[PDB]
Amino acid sequence: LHSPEAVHTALAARQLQGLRTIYARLRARLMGGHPGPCHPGHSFRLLDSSPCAESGDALYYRVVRAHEDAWHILVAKVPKPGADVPHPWGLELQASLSPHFNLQGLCGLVPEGTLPGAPWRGAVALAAEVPERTVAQWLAEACTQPPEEFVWAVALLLLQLSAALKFLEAWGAALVELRPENLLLVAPRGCATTGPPRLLLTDFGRVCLQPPGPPGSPGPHAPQLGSLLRALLSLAAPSTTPLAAGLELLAAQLTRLRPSASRTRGALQALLWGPGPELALGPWLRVRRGLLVLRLAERAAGGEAPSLEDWLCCEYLAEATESSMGQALALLWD
Amino acid sequence: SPEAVHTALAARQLQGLRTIYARLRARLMGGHPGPCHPGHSFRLLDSSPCAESGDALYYRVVRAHEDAWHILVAKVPKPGADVPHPWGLELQASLSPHFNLQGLCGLVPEGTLPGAPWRGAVALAAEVPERTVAQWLAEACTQPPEEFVWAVALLLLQLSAALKFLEAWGAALVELRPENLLLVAPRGCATTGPPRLLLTDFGRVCLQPPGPPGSPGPHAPQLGSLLRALLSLAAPSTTPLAAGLELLAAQLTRLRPSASRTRGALQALLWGPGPELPWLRALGPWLRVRRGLLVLRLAERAAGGEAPSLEDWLCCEYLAEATESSMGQALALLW
């Protein structure tokens, strides 16, 4: 109204409120369908006579929990014969934590005599999620993708792993080692079927209490992500794209500078979408937030669903700030 | 250089809005059955019409073109029907398909479907009728809300689009009657909201060679009279749109405006500004803001799993094609 700049501010304020509404609606569907806790009135019957998935520490079978003429599908996690538990408290933590997009949740336990005809004997915990493949099983096929196609797919799975780890670092606990065979992949709920899978962390036997320490401390997982990132990158076909060049520099920075999981997510999101080192940043983020909303509207016109990558992108752009992008760029060009 | 970024953003959302309109229009006009050939096979679906219009009984028929699946409907002449202007029926076969016109795909003579309830050779329409406008009004005006005039104004904009196509042609309809108009669901972009309107009454459409304005819209004084009848059937005039329709009916009979001027003023009541907007100076940033808000609303609906309605496609047609001179006419005709 007689001030083009006030109109520009009102448009940024409303499209950002819409961007948070878009994120919250997609998150509510993406995290929907969670089964309630197990009760004495629930009848448990087996689906899989052989493992539906295998991790490094356990075998997984589906079980149907029937009640009130309906049911939920839960997974029984059966530890492999000879498997150890370096940190038993991490299993007590798994049963104490609320649901998280990238962590394996529990809905209860099947005690002895409650599930007839099982492949195993003894009380078993019930996981809320249903597995499809391990990260190692995905790599066995995925390493045949074109250079940039494979590397992008891995870079987005790494962003999910950093978030799962950020929760744990803010919580006050850490993994002693990273093992892709205990990282499981499933299709995301309510998202396009051709996008990236949802990443679940299951290795709670390796999670231990680790106090955050002083404000100048190193990130407890940084040298594990640096070495793992280089081993995963050595599986990609060669490319000259900035994406692969930034991921190799970030691996050197993870072992050299030792950033936290929240600083790691910032630089990785900045490499995936962010500006170059030349920035100043406000106008860029305001244009990119508006462009994702236009792409979502243009594809909706064709009856196309958003993918998990678009929910993760809209999450970065909605949470991105000038101070956060300053830190993200600083690691990238240093 | 923020001024350079704001110019680039307006151009980037404009090509996206035109792409959204073209993709939703392509879904709405998708599957149009092709012309009838010796390769087509037909089967009867019913013994009673899917729509009963003033001068036609509409029966649904299956067609297959080399095993390509199509549904078409026979326009069986209703007993007592006539043709005051036979040229208008030649015009219906002549013109290209249009979203709000009743299209034809060819003739099916008697004997193709031995079990048919009709006799004689009957042409088959591309669209599949569900009800007439008079049939919708009988129930729809029984328990209207005060905002009911919203559903009527949107069907009126569609009828004005069908009449604008004929007015751009060499043609006019001499007698306008809601009992001869048809409503169907939109294809590919379907919701429970307003139906697609089809203009059917070509038996009464005559030649219109005049150049000078004369009466600019031969259909306007007829729409003004029908709109006053519709406003007395609807809920009390408590919504600004009902008051806008009351003065619009007086203007339709007083000024006899063309369908293109009726669509401008009617779109201004539906989505555009009133006299609160000289006033027209605000239209530049008003279209840029309203165009961006519709793109944002479509993305927020998609985030919730809600498809766009035919109203949202008509809204994006109005906003993508509206200009400062078109909105200047729209507002000047209303006030």
Residue numbers in the entry:
A (entry chain A): 128 to 406, 419 to 473
B (entry chain B): 130 to 406, 415 to 472
What text comes from the article?
PEAK pseudokinases are molecular scaffolds which dimerize to regulate cell migration, morphology, and proliferation, as well as cancer progression. The pseudopodium-enriched atypical kinase (PEAK) family of pseudokinases, also known as New Kinase Family 3 (NKF3), is composed of three members: PEAK1 (also known as Sugen kinase [SgK] 269), PEAK2 (also known as Pragmin or SgK223), and PEAK3 (also known as chromosome 19 Open Reading Frame 35 [C19orf35]). Crystal structures of truncated PEAK1 and PEAK2 lacking the unstructured N-terminal domains revealed that these pseudokinase domain-flanking helices fold into an “XL”-shaped helical bundle and facilitate dimerization by forming an “XX”-shaped high-affinity dimerization interface termed the Split HElical Dimerization (SHED) domain. 14-3-3s are ubiquitous regulatory proteins that act as dimeric scaffolds to modulate their client proteins through a wide array of mechanisms, such as altering protein-protein interactions, inducing conformational changes, regulating subcellular localization, and sterically blocking access to phosphorylation sites.
We observed both PEAK3/14-3-3 complex and PEAK3 homodimer particles in the cryo-EM dataset; however, these particles exhibited orientation bias which limited our ability to reconstruct high-resolution maps. The addition of detergent to combat the orientation bias required us to work in a higher protein concentration regime, which shifted the particle equilibrium toward the complex, limiting the number of PEAK3-only particles. Nevertheless, the available PEAK3-only particles were initially processed in CryoSPARC and then re-extracted and imported to RELION for 3D classification and refinement to further alleviate streaking artifacts common for samples with preferred orientation. This yielded a low-resolution (4.9 Å) reconstruction of the PEAK3 homodimer. The limited resolution could be due to the low number of particles in the resulting reconstruction, especially impactful for a protein of this small size (108,034 Da). Another possibility is that the apo-PEAK3 homodimer exhibits conformational flexibility that is reduced upon 14-3-3 binding. Globally, however, comparison of the PEAK3/14-3-3 structure with the low-resolution structure of the PEAK3 homodimer alone did not reveal major differences within the PEAK3 dimer, with an overall average RMSD of 0.623 Å. The overall architecture of the PEAK3 pseudokinase homodimer within the PEAK3/14-3-3 complex, or alone solved at lower resolution, shows significant twisting between two pseudokinase domains instigated by rotations of the SHED domain helices, αJ and αL, relative to PEAK1 and PEAK2. These differences are thus independent from 14-3-3 binding and intrinsic to PEAK3.
